[PDB]
Amino acid sequence: ASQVRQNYHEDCEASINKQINMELYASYVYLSMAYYFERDDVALPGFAKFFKESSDEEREHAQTFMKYQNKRGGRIVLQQIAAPSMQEWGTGLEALQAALDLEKQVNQSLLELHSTASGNNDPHLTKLLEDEYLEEQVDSIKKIGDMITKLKRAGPHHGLGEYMFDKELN
């Protein structure tokens, strides 16, 4: 085995490879949304910017797991990245709602990964999950929830409220 490996269970190694693919997938979803909002018949530049940043961040999140895998002595196994569920995302509200659901799905996976790490007595992995993923995930979920409420207040259907709220994200 790896000269560096120590207290690193095969199940955590495999779950990290699954989380890598999921982070890359979420990055791909947000990339799809980003350029959907730059279509000439959508033209929501604030939403496009918001989702392009989230796409970059999720790709960074994937790479932090890849560095982590190598650091512990695991071996990165990269799978296929699925096409995004949608090709068109509707209104800003509907995209935010899809993002909220995705973020909560990633959070569930991460909490399961923490349970795996905790069950195998790997405090180094639980620390990584708490400090670098679980904290960020809760803040992201709270932020998206705030945005949904703000957009529902401003007027969530294709109108002046959506146009004004989009400026808040620019």
* Residue list for the binding site: 23, 57-58, 61, 103, 131, 136-137, 140
Which residues, numbered 129-158, are part of the site for Ni ion (CB under 5 A)? 157
> Which tokens is 13 given?
């190694």
State the binding partner of 85 from Fe ion, Ni ion, a second copy, none, CB within 5 to 8 A by kind: none
CA 147/CA 60 separation, integer angstroms: 23
When CB distances are held under 5 to 8 angstroms depending on the partner's kind, the choice from Ni ion, a second copy, Fe ion, none that residue 157 binds is Ni ion
Mapped onto helix, strand or coil, the DSSP state of residue 167 is helix
Q: Alpha carbon of 98 to those of 114, 141, 159: distances in Å? A: 24, 12, 20
Q: Give, as ranges, the residues between 97 and 126 that touch Ni ion (CB under 5 A).
A: none
The reply to whether 61 sits near Fe ion by the rule CB under 5 A is yes
State how far the Cα of 66 lies from the Cα of 152, in Å rounded to an integer: 38
Closest distance to Ni ion from the beta carbon of 160 (Å): 14
